[PDB]
RNA sequence: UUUUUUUUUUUUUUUUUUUUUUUUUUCUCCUCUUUUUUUUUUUU
């Protein structure tokens, strides 16, 4: 009953989908996105994704 | 004492041409474990 509906809350994207640069020019100025470098552990290594600025991407 | 006649190896040579490696499939896919990550230092 689960993998219906797991499988039919996915549809047809699996990652969001990237967008242009200037974008990203204007969102460093107006001041609403940081950037640093991204490491990851590896005991963990699907999970424990982190971001340099510590950033935890779960 | 046994004369005379019954052809034979197809004729021909003094024709133009402006393309080009290959060539045509096989799907999505669970990476197991003390960690933050250590870090100066000197002898190459």
Same mark, same amino acid.
């Given at each position: $009953? %689960? $993998?219906?509906?797991? =499988?039919q809350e =996915?549809? /047809?994207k699996?990652? *969001?989908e990237? +967008? *242009?640069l200037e974008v +990203?020019? !204007?969102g460093i100025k107006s001041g609403r996105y940081?950037? /640093?470098?991204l490491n990851v552990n590896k005991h963990r290594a699907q999970? %424990? !994704?982190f971001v340099r600025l510590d950033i935890l991407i779960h």
């Open positions: $009953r %689960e $993998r219906e509906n797991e =499988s =996915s549809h /047809g699996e990652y *969001p990237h +967008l *242009p +990203l020019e !204007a940081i950037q /640093g470098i999970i %424990e !994704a």
